[PDB]
Amino acid sequence: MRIYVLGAGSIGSLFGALLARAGNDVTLIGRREQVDAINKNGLHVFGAEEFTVKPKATIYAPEEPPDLLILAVKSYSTKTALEAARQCIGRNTWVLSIQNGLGNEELALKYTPNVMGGVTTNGAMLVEWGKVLWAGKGITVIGRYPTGRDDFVDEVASVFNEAGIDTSVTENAIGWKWAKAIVNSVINGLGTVLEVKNGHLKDDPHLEGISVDIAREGCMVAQQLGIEFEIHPLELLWDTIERTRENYNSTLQDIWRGRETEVDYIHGKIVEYARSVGMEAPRNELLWVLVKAKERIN
Amino acid sequence: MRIYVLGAGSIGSLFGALLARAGNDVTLIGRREQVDAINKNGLHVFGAEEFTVKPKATIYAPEEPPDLLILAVKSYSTKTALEAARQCIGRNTWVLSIQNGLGNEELALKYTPNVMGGVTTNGAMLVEWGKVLWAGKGITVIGRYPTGRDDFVDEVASVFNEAGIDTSVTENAIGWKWAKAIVNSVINGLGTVLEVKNGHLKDDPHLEGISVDIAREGCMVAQQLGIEFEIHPLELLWDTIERTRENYNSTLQDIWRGRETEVDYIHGKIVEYARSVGMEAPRNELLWVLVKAKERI
Ligand SMILES: NC(=O)c1ccc[n+]([C@@H]2O[C@H](COP(=O)([O-])OP(=O)(O)OC[C@H]3O[C@@H](n4cnc5c(N)ncnc54)[C@H](OP(=O)(O)O)[C@@H]3O)[C@@H](O)[C@H]2O)c1
Ligand SMILES: NC(=O)c1ccc[n+]([C@@H]2O[C@H](COP(=O)([O-])OP(=O)(O)OC[C@H]3O[C@@H](n4cnc5c(N)ncnc54)[C@H](OP(=O)(O)O)[C@@H]3O)[C@@H](O)[C@H]2O)c1
Numbered sequence: 116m117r118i119y120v121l122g123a124g125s126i127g128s129l130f131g132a133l134l135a136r137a138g139n140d141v142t143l144i145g146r147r148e149q150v151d152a153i154n155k156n157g158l159h160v161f162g163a164e165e166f167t168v169k170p171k172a173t174i175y176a177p178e179e180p181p182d183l184l185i186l187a188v189k190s191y192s193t194k195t196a197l198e199a200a201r202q203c204i205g206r207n208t209w210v211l212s213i214q215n216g217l218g219n220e221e222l223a224l225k226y227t228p229n230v231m232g233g234v235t236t237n238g239a240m241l242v243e244w245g246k247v248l249w250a251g252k253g254i255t256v257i258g259r260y261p262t263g264r265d266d267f268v269d270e271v272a273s274v275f276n277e278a279g280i281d282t283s284v285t286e287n288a289i290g291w292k293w294a295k296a297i298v299n300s301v302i303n304g305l306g307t308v309l310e311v312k313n314g315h316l317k318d319d320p321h322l323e324g325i326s327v328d329i330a331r332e333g334c335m336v337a338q339q340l341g342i343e344f345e346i347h348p349l350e351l352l353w354d355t356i357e358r359t360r361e362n363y364n365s366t367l368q369d370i371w372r373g374r375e376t377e378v379d380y381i382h383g384k385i386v387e388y389a390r391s392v393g394m395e396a397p398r399n400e401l402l403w404v405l406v407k408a409k410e411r412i413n
Numbered sequence: 414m415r416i417y418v419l420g421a422g423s424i425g426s427l428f429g430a431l432l433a434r435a436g437n438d439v440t441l442i443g444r445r446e447q448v449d450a451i452n453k454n455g456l457h458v459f460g461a462e463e464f465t466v467k468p469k470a471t472i473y474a475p476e477e478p479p480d481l482l483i484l485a486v487k488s489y490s491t492k493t494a495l496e497a498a499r500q501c502i503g504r505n506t507w508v509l510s511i512q513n514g515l516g517n518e519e520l521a522l523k524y525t526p527n528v529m530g531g532v533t534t535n536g537a538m539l540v541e542w543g544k545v546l547w548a549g550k551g552i553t554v555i556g557r558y559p560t561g562r563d564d565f566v567d568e569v570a571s572v573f574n575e576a577g578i579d580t581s582v583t584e585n586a587i588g589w590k591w592a593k594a595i596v597n598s599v600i601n602g603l604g605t606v607l608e609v610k611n612g613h614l615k616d617d618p619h620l621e622g623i624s625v626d627i628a629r630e631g632c633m634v635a636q637q638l639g640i641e642f643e644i645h646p647l648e649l650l651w652d653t654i655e656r657t658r659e660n661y662n663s664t665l666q667d668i669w670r671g672r673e674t675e676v677d678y679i680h681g682k683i684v685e686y687a688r689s690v691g692m693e694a695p696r697n698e699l700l701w702v703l704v705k706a707k708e709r710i
Contacts, residue, residue, distance in 0.1 A: 308606065309706050325702045328695070397626070397695040404623040408607055411617065 116140070116274050117181040121200050123149045123172065126213060127187030128247040129239035130280065132160045135170040137278040142171040142181070144200065150174055152245030163249035164279075180205025183271060186223065190216035190380035193223075201226055209267055211257060215365075216380030217296050217388075220260040220289070231268055232288035233257040234295045236358065237280070253358070254281045258288030287345045290337075294348040297333035298355050299381050301326045303366035304402035307409070310367060314360035317353060326352065329398045336389045336396050370410050378406045414438065414572050417479040419498050421447045421470065424511060425485030426545040427537035428578065430456045433468035435576035440469040440479070442498065448472055450543030461547035462577075478503025481569060484521065488514040488678035491521075499524055507565055509555060513663075514678030515594050515686075518558040518587070529566050530586035531555035532593045534656070535578075551656070552579050556586030585643045588635075592646040595631035596653050597679050599624045601664035602700035605707065608665060612658030615651065624650065627696045634687045634694055668708050676704045 116139050120131040123145025135141040135158070143153065153172035160166050180203055188196045193214070204210070210223040213233040223230045236253020257272060259265050264286050275282035285291055305316050305326060316322050330349050337344070369376040382403035389396040414437050418429040421443030433439040433456070441451060448470040450456075455467035474482075478501055486494045491512065502508065507527040510517040521528040534551025555570055557563045562584055573580035583589055603614050603624060614620045628647050635642070664674045680694075680701035687694040 305703075308703060309710065311710065319706060321702045322706055325699055328698070332695075397630075398699055400626070401623060401696050401699055404619050405603075405606060408617055408620055412607070412609070 116183060116270070118142070118183045118185065119144060119176060119181040119200075119203055120185045120187050121176060121196055122186065122188035122192070123153075124187060124189075125239040125241040125247060126235065126237065127185070128158060128241055129160065129237060129249055130185060130187065130213065130235075131170055132158050132166070132168050132247065133278045133280055134274070135168040136166060137274070139274065139278070140181075142173065142177060144173055144176050147174055148244045149241075152243075156245055159246045160249055161246070163252050176200035176203040178202050180208050182208070182267075184208055184210050186210060186212040186214055186219060188214070189375070190214055190219060190377045191375060193219050197222060197226060209271070211271065212260075213255070213257075215295060215299055216377050217292060217384040218380060220292065224260070229267075230260045231257055231265075231271070232260040232292050234291050236355075238362075251358075252281070254283065256283055256285050256288075256291050258285035258291070260292075261289035262287055285345060287343070290342055290344045293333075293337045293342050294344055294346065294351050296381055296385065297330055297337070297348040298352045300333055300385060300399055300402065301329045301352055302355065303364045303376075303378065303381060304329065304399075304406065306364040307367040307370065308402065308405050310363075312360065313356050313362055313364060317356045325398075329402070332396050332398050333385055336385055336392075336394060336399075339392050339394060340388055366406060370406075370413075373413055376406065376410055378403055382406070414481060414569075415479040416440070416481045416483060417442060417474055417498075417501060418483045418485055419443075419474060419494055420483075420485035420487075420490075421451070422485060422487075423537035423539045423545060424533065424535065425483070426456060426539055427458070427535060427547055428483060428485065428511070428533075429468055430458045430464075430466050430545065431576045431578055432572070433466040434464060435572070437572065437576070438479075440471065440475060442471055442474050445472050446542045447539075450541075454543055457544040459544065459546060461550050474498035474501040476500045478506045480506065480565075482506055482508050484508065484510040484512055484517060486512070487673070488512055488517060488675045489673060491517050495520055495524060507569070509569065511553070513593060513597055514675050515590060515682040516678060518590065522558070527565075528558045529555055529563075529569070530558040530590050532589045534653070536657075536660075549656075550579065552581060554581050554583050554586075554589050556583035556589070559587035560585055583643060585641070588640055588642050591631075591635045591640055592642055592644070592649050594679055594683065595628055595635070595646045596650045597662075598631050598683060598697055598700065599627050599650055600654065601662045601674075601676065601679060602627065602697075602704065604662040605665040605668065606700065606703050609661075610658065611654050611660050611662060615654050627700070630694055630696045631683055634683055634690075634692060634697075637690045637692060638686055664704065668704075671708075674704065674708060676701055680704070 123143040150172040157169040209229040212219040235255040238250030272282045382399040421441040451470040508521040533553040536548030538546040680697045684694045
């Protein structure tokens with residue numbers, strides 16, 4: 116399958132390399148550092164698995180329409196990225212977002228109805244240009260956005276599974292995006308504010324309870340928007356916490372590296388949609404302000 | 414006036430020493446290190462003004478009823494303190510609480526109807542046994558709890574004013590306790606969580622806005638309990654913040670020293686009354702949990 120990965124960062128390089136090993140026509144689109152590093156010494160994956168591939172790398176999305184375009188930039192870069200890559204979106208090109216936060220798929224829908232949403236539990240960290248750490252293996256869930264199904268979605272899931280990417284298909288992708296967003300609101304909120312590992316958030320009974328509170332806030336916001344959940348975000352919350360006990364959340368890491376966070380598209384979007392349906396959602400807003408303010412004092 | 418000060422800490426030693434200087438019959442009650450320091454070399458005030466007085470000091474409240482008993486312990490000790498000093502509460506003994514948080518005056522009312530609530534903007538810090546730093550001068554507001562007025566309250570205010578304690582009388586003391594409590598919710602919440610100076614909460618526009626949100630949460634909680642405000646708490650909030658820009662809030666200081674905080678009686682009480690009246694205080698609750706989590710870490 117012809118696959119372009121827009122955003123050759125961590126998870127983009129992971130997915131790109133995994134898809135590259137299987138024999139797929141993979142093109143990575145990213146920074147000039149990443150592109151040069153890959154073009155001269157290849158892309159190296161280490162950790163959960165260790166190998167070296169040589170996918171095509173470039174800073175410009177090729178003017179030749181792929182079968183699949185994977186959005187792998189951070190949420191604050193999506194809209195520009197799409198504009199920078201719209202020349203590659205052909206009539207049958209499907210757009211898959213494996214990003215966190217909300218609104219990415221809706222941004223993708225401005226170019227084509229062929230859009231699918233996705234969430235991955237895989238951990239990836241680009242430690243060096245041309246070098247990515249597969250921190251952990253996890254399940255990936257993709258589906259036609261917002262709901263339903265399509266043969267090509269099944270085919271993408273088949274290519275992924277073949278490629279060693281454990282993938283299942285949902286008919287409620289938007290519910291997964293929102294569930295993941297709520298879990299992320301709790302974890303990337305509290306964990307970042309208190310600067311603790313994820314497991315801590317369940318171990319402290321008060322933190323556990325307030326986690327529950329935040330979660331039901333997000334859930335009520337989602338359900339008033341006519342979004343239901345195949346799997347309730349609390350089960351996904353305690354599961355995710357159980358899988359990442361030894362990990363500091365990605366937002367806290369972003370603050371630590373001096374990087375920009377995605378909370379404008381996590382807590383921010385939840386607050387936005389809440390306001391869009393006449394609600395307010397206090398906890399997500401307070402967490403949003405706190406995290407942004409913490410980021411400001413680098 | 415005969416005044417026993419229960420809790421010879423910072424503000425207790427400040428008020429106690431000022432009242433002793435004025436010529437009042439003042440007795441300080443606290444931990445012994447303080448008692449021994451005062452009984453052996455006296456009480457030393459430095460900072461805003463500097464002087465030395467030697468009031469009576471003891472660890473147990475004398476069995477002879479004072480005209481006025483001042484609560485200057487931390488909010489988590491009040492109940493206990495009240496039980497340990499209950500023998501001095503006579504028929505004409507008035508109890509004045511200058512503590513932060515809520516419920517102190519209600520705790521005092523279990524011993525006597527002679528209770529007045531008070532809030533002070535004065536800054537005080539016990540740096541050493543027998544020495545207290547007068548960090549800043551501020552107005553003191555007292556009144557018969559919860560509302561109304563009384564001649565002895567006016568008299569206490571007169572004694573305070575003559576003692577160099579800038580003091581005014583209110584007919585809405587509970588409203589003042591709640592205003593100060595809301596302001597403290599905002600400041601000791603945000604300021605402690607982010608580990609920033611008070612002024613910062615206004616320098617960052619976002620922190621300012623969310624401060625407004627928290628403050629009005631507290632205000633709605635206060636409003637369902639039938640409590641109105643003589644002056645709006647938000648005005649008092651920015652007032653306090655500009656007067657204390659270079660200062661880290663008392664809760665953050667406590668956490669830095671590893672001391673216990675009073676947030677159970679600030680955010681905790683607000684949440685408590687909110688749930689008790691069928692409401693929700695999400696911001697105050699979340700801040701409560703965050704701060705309570707931060708002391709352990
Ligand atoms: N990392 C993980 O393990 C993981 C796991 C699950 C989900 N996710 C989600 O996947 C998304 C990506 O995360 P990430 O960790 O991979 O961050 P990342 O390493 O920064 O990946 C984004 C890359 O895409 C680049 N980029 C942005 N706009 C571009 C454009 N028009 N053209 C080409 N490249 C562009 C970025 O460059 P610049 O930095 O210069 O903008 C960056 O190199 C996030 O939303 C994340 O929540 C990540
Ligand atoms: N510090 C200020 O500038 C200021 C200003 C306005 C309002 N306030 C409020 O006033 C209250 C206390 O302030 P603070 O700074 O003075 O605290 P503080 O320095 O800790 O003083 C409290 C003292 O009372 C002692 N104590 C507790 N129980 C006692 C008991 N039965 N008998 C005798 N002593 C007892 C405490 O001993 P232990 O520590 O061993 O328990 C402590 O020494 C708080 O509610 C505060 O919010 C303070």
